[PDB]
Amino acid sequence: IPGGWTRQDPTEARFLELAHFATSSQTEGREFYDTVVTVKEVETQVVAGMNYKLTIEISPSVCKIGEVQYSAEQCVPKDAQQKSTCVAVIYHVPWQNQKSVTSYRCEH
Numbered sequence: 001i002p003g004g005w006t007r008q009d010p011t012e013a014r015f016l017e018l019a020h021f022a023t024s025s026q027t028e029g030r031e032f033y034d035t036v037v038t039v040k041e042v043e044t045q046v047v048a049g050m051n052y053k054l055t056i057e058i059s060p061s062v063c064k065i066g067e068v069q070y071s072a073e074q075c076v077p078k079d080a081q082q083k084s085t086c087v088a089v090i091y092h093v094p095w096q097n098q099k100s101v102t103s104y105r106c107e108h
């Protein structure tokens, strides 16, 4: 098993699922949840578990934080033309059912 990053097909559903998980989770200093517009790039790394590195475009959603629960389906972009590019790293330990956001960094 190599230690490096392996580039994936970014259009896979599981990666969109993970992108929403990471984005829905960024709630500091906002009135609204941000949401995912697009998954541009994906890289995985085998550690004691799996690292997912997602390059995504995000946009503010219609869902107000603390007013509703986040869902991909409900929380569409206010305006999907207003995009920001971020890199999210998710650490997954499948046998403990744990996902954490290692880092979430927006170029903008």
Ligand SMILES: [Cl-]
Pocket: none
């Ligand atoms: Cl690394």
